[PDB]
Design an enzyme around this catalytic site. Structure first.
Site, mmCIF file in Angstrom:
data_model
loop_
_atom_site.group_PDB
_atom_site.id
_atom_site.type_symbol
_atom_site.label_atom_id
_atom_site.label_comp_id
_atom_site.label_asym_id
_atom_site.label_seq_id
_atom_site.Cartn_x
_atom_site.Cartn_y
_atom_site.Cartn_z
ATOM 1 N N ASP A 1 0.823 -1.200 0.000
ATOM 2 C CA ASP A 1 0.000 0.000 0.000
ATOM 3 C C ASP A 1 0.862 1.257 0.000
ATOM 4 O OD1 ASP A 1 -1.896 1.910 0.340
ATOM 5 O OD2 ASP A 1 -2.420 1.350 2.398
ATOM 6 N N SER B 1 -0.560 15.464 -12.028
ATOM 7 C CA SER B 1 -0.797 15.092 -13.401
ATOM 8 C C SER B 1 -1.026 16.348 -14.234
ATOM 9 C CB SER B 1 -2.002 14.156 -13.485
ATOM 10 O OG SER B 1 -2.382 13.912 -14.820
#
EC number: 3.4.23.22
Length: 330
Positions: free
Chosen positions: A35, A199
């Protein structure tokens, strides 16, 4: 040193991925959910409330000759999906894919929430976010990666998650045969303890690319792709009959649909998520309404590039002094 381990989807939907981890001496192999959005290595154990164990493999520290109770240490974690666990702490030898860390904090669960109990395939989590998020008290502990880093050939790990197929976590090296083209690296903020990056935009299907900054985290421990409501609406608008369902808890779409791809930007590079990666199947058994793999982050407070996004890429988690993230197509 290096390590390399195969990671395997837990079910036919790729809801999560499990990777075998050797703990203790002799080894006890548990299948952990790696994770990159959290920083605790915790396991179902011989200390876990019996009624909260249902099929998981447990770590039994009393059977490990290298286990030592970390005196006074406790841990307690709550995840974004509402699940939680807590317990006490041992140090022990932990190996992943041939890479061994001695003295790793292994957080033994005394309690786990129902969602963990109900998932027999996940024996615990191995956190790979920054150690500043580790919940051990009163002395915070380091992640497996943090402990291994100095020994690694290169201070990196990579996630290569499969679509409906196994994939690989590598530690200490970049497998240049595992991706196509080049890896585009992008800046990371560690301020929130995550692999947080920005992004450069998105496209839906064959549509034009929209240049827009989307801050979010690379999180292997989250199944879906959670993005701003504007982006998500633009995606689902291209799917006839798709709608946001408050009763179901997100966007659903007719299972008869063929989904468009979704592209996200990494600098000037582009990662394309095929439409089929965005199908999470019937909302309930036998339903013709299917759950979407792109969902709104509104009210999460952060955008999350979960498995839906990451599995479309070869992803480098560069733990150099100034961390960065790399993405390549594959």
């Amino acid at each position: 040193s290096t390590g390399s381990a195969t990671t395997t989807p837990i079910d036919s939907l790729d809801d999560a991925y499990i990777t075998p981890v050797q703990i203790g001496t002799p080894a006890q192999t548990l299948n952990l959910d790696f994770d990159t959005g959290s920083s605790d290595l915790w396991v179902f154990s011989s200390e876990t409330t019996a009624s909260e164990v249902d099929g998981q493999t447990i770590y039994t520290p009393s059977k490990s000759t290298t286990a030592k109770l970390l005196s006074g240490a406790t841990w307690s974690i709550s995840y974004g999906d509402g699940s939680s666990s807590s317990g006490d702490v041992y140090t022990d030898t932990v190996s992943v894919g041939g890479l061994t860390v001695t003295g790793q904090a292994v957080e033994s669960a005394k309690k786990v929430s129902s969602s963990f109990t109900e998932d027999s395939t996940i024996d615990g989590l191995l956190g790979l976010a920054f150690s500043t998020l580790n919940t051990v008290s009163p002395t915070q502990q380091k992640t497996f990666f943090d402990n291994a880093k100095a020994s690694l050939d290169s201070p990196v790990f990579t996630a290569d998650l499969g679509y409906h197929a196994p994939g690989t976590y590598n530690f200490g090296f970049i497998d240049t045969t595992a991706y196509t083209g080049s890896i585009t690296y992008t800046a990371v903020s560690t301020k929130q303890g995550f692999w947080e990056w920005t992004s450069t935009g998105y496209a839906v299907g064959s549509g034009t690319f929209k240049s827009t900054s989307i801050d979010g985290i690379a999180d292997t421990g989250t199944t879906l792709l959670y993005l701003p409501a504007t982006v998500v609406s633009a995606y689902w608008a291209q799917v006839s009959g798709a709608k946001s369902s408050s009763s179901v808890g997100g966007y659903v779409f007719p299972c008869s649909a063929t989904l468009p791809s979704f592209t996200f930007g990494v600098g000037s590079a582009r990662i394309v998520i095929p439409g089929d990666y965005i199908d999470f199947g019937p909302i309930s058994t036998g339903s013709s309404s299917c759950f979407g793999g792109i969902q709104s982050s509104a009210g999460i407070g952060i955008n999350i590039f979960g498995d839906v996004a990451l599995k479309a890429a070869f992803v480098v988690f560069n733990g150099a002094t100034t961390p960065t993230l790399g993405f390549a197509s594959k």
